[PDB]
Symmetry: C4
């Protein structure tokens, strides 16, 4: 059960993006079965360029892509955009004070996708926005990886790789 | 061989849907080999809304989606519908008294799919029908999960993950 | 390393088809590494109907679908057909005496595929031909299963599931 | 942790191509976690025909296909080409002296793809170029295998097959 850091990164002129999977959460039932209590998701980290081959991760902005949001990305038409809005303090007394918006847009010549994360603190009059262009080839890698990971994020791999053993017992 | 509860759920205004995979069944042969005697399937559970963030699972209706039916869903055209009819007491002396019909339809503006389960007891003059709208993004998650699970439901994962070991022995 | 019989079957009015995967073959090298010496394939068995819910497997005809042939099937256009020709005694002194031809054709109304296996013994003036219609939904199940199995048939799953362990050692 | 040689080969009249996966590289951290330090890739080896059913592997040329390049291949449109340029001695004092170019083109009648590797040593006035035609069916096998392997090359399979165990511990 060793930890594996396997972020997938895209490095561009003005920004970098790293994408890391996060496992679903389970709880143990009295019977000893486990129940999925939280879906997995993907953590996106965006950082602005800060120097030659260097990005300022101290100023990174993050966004947690849910299973449904991954579904949006893997089904985008060639001229379709999607936009996701998250309040990181929903529930908590800081609700409504910060909005994170991830937008994904087609590049105007068909050559790929434009990702934008904007993190907006209205009371503080600050919008921190990071853009990164993603080629069609890079986006295809994401589609493949996203389709791969979805069954794991919803816990179905746990079901899948359990068939071979349970069938014997 | 611990049990894993990993239902995938979609919660909407008037209804909820949870989808749970079910493993194929095997029997042990004299030689010690195992033979697949029943394909796996997906169990769909639909429940009508019953209160704030609450659904009446005591009034749930269920439908067992076969491998072939999953195949229908993963191959639907954008304007195509499919409809499945099941008699839950086929064979048994209650045959013909109850019909369950699952219909899947395109939403009229291209924004996703409409699922409907209708469970009809004619002798009792009752039709219990639950509808739930599924966005294009949510349906894409299902397509990915369904394509993932199909090889497991037909027992081919058992073949797949056996290659690495048998090859040695 | 127990044996698993996991044929996937399609049963129709006049014929049945069962499809069984077969593993690649390896040899052990002096160093202890293994080398893939034969790709895996799929074994198709066709049988004509012989009675109520019964097929005459004693008169079955078989065809071994190679990796490349699977590739043809998973890339067929909607109006495209493919046809494969095999001599089961190529090399052997019976070469040229028996031809097996598998043809896969679109159904004229878009509703699926028509599979035909014809096994022809010219010296004996016999053509034994079995046809089976496959719905779009059933064909979609095959496409999913075929795309799943291809990496296993070429031995890449062996590479894939070895990463997690070798990385530690 | 036995080594597996599982190159996938295509043998044609004038040339052969073999494609072998290569695992990502990890390093062990003090905590005992592992960190991915180099993505996996695919090694392509091209050899010109040298005799009946024989190819001159002593004159082979090789090209390392990155994850992003695999992404290009799996997203090619039917009339689209892609071309990759590599300097094998980038950094090293031999930088700029040798260029390897892999080009992938549609065949003019829609029947598949033309792969070309050209390895050019300008100071030596030599261009060694190997071409191999790939049918639509053979290319489909590659697309399936490439989509399969991508999540392993980026280390996400390591994440995937770790969920089942970590969840318990």
């Amino acid at each position: 059960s060793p930890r594996f850091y396997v972020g997938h990164s895209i490095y561009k002129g003005k920004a970098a993006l790293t994408i890391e999977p996060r496992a679903p959460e389970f709880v143990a039932l009295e019977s000893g079965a486990f129940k999925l209590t939280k879906e997995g998701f993907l953590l996106l980290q965006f950082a602005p360029a800060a120097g030659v081959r260097q990005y300022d991760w101290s100023r990174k902005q993050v966004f947690s892509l849910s299973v449904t949001e991954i579904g949006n990305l893997v089904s985008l038409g060639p001229r379709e955009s999607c936009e996701f809005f998250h309040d990181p303090f929903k529930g908590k007394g800081d609700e409504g004070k910060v909005r994170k918006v991830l937008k994904v847009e087609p590049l105007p010549d068909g050559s790929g996708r434009f990702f934008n994360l904007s993190v907006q603190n209205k009371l503080l009059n600050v919008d921190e926005s990071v853009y990164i262009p993603i080629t069609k080839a890079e986006f295809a890698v994401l589609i493949s990886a996203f389709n791969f990971v979805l069954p794991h994020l919803i816990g179905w791999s746990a079901f899948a790789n359990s068939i071979k053993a349970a069938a014997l017992e």
